[PDB]
Design a protein around this ligand. Sequence first.
Ligand SMILES: COCCN1CCCC[C@H](NC(=O)[C@H](CC(C)C)[C@H](CCCO)C(=O)NO)C1=O
Ligand SMILES: [Ca+2]
Ligand SMILES: [Ca+2]
Ligand SMILES: [Ca+2]
Ligand SMILES: [Ca+2]
Ligand SMILES: [Ca+2]
Ligand SMILES: [Ca+2]
Ligand SMILES: [Zn+2]
Ligand SMILES: [Zn+2]
Ligand SMILES: [Zn+2]
Ligand SMILES: [Zn+2]
Lengths: 173, 169
Amino acid sequence: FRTFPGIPKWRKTHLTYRIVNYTPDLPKDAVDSAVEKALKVWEEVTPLTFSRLYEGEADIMISFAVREHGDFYPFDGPGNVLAHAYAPGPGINGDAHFDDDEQWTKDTTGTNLFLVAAHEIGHSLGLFHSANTEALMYPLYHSLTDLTRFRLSQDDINGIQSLYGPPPDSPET
Amino acid sequence: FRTFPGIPKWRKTHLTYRIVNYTPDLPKDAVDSAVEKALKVWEEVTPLTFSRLYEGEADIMISFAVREHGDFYPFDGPGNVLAHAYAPGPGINGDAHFDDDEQWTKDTTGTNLFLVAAHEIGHSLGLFHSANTEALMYPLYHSLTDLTRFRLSQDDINGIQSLYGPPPD
Ligand SMILES: COCCN1CCCC[C@H](NC(=O)[C@H](CC(C)C)[C@H](CCCO)C(=O)NO)C1=O
Ligand SMILES: [Ca+2]
Ligand SMILES: [Ca+2]
Ligand SMILES: [Ca+2]
Ligand SMILES: [Ca+2]
Ligand SMILES: [Ca+2]
Ligand SMILES: [Ca+2]
Ligand SMILES: [Zn+2]
Ligand SMILES: [Zn+2]
Ligand SMILES: [Zn+2]
Ligand SMILES: [Zn+2]
């Protein structure tokens, strides 16, 4: 694992999230679930919880974005970069942007929304890019079939738990 | 009616559109529906036609947007500016953005998506604001209950025919 410069992490354990808008590609439900599920993955192995806002501002603001969208970092069209997100902190920090010139998918067809959402929630949570290829925080989106063999790697566990520790109801091996 | 400076138009009657993203506020089909209704209202009086692109850049790109977005013209929060659009031409020209710090509704309980989409597409097609109270291109939002009576005013027709002509026959 890596982290960001001098350990940007959150100070509180209950975070908020808003999905600011929706993709042409999937129905709203598929979006939601992928997000619910991406949060869950980090929840499961730490003391953090999340909760959903329909209006106002949230720690993690989640949106779909084409090209120029309002930050300092425009997207590149179909291909290359698939998404980007921001380290802990106020405002734009915490926040997560999905390239809609990709094809977001519920399975393995185009770009998997869950897989990616997980990766970029690693960013909003304080993790950077891993060296470990087998880790979710490696900067490549890999050629996959089985989404049931989504488990985080040990590197991932190790990095999010060095930030936040393990869950309160959890034993340690 | 009124038009833009140096009369910007489309030099082509078959126009393309893309709904670039979707609002939390509404069902997706209620978005789509309000779009093709806003399009239709202008199509019924000219030789224009629309088709929907799902990829690529289309002539009229339609999107939802909050504060600072793709352009030099941030949205403003709840109320005031509801949406905006660019006169005919390439790029962002032709394109229509919507302030998602409104509540878009299919009815008149919040901000009616059809109504605003229609006004805005008027802009995308070459019309500036009208001096006519009864006109769709008049700059003023009514919270207009009776959509049930909705007509393009004769002004709106005059102005859009002056650009593109009436229907073929
Ligand atoms: C489908 O194409 C797969 C190969 N591709 C396409 C070829 C370029 C790289 C690419 N990676 C990304 O765009 C990711 C995102 C991933 C890992 C989801 C980025 C940008 C990296 C450079 O800064 C990211 O890590 N954001 O946090 C990617 O996974
Ligand atoms: Ca891209
Ligand atoms: Ca934030
Ligand atoms: Ca897409
Ligand atoms: Ca355009
Ligand atoms: Ca507004
Ligand atoms: Ca809204
Ligand atoms: Zn961005
Ligand atoms: Zn990344
Ligand atoms: Zn704009
Ligand atoms: Zn206007």
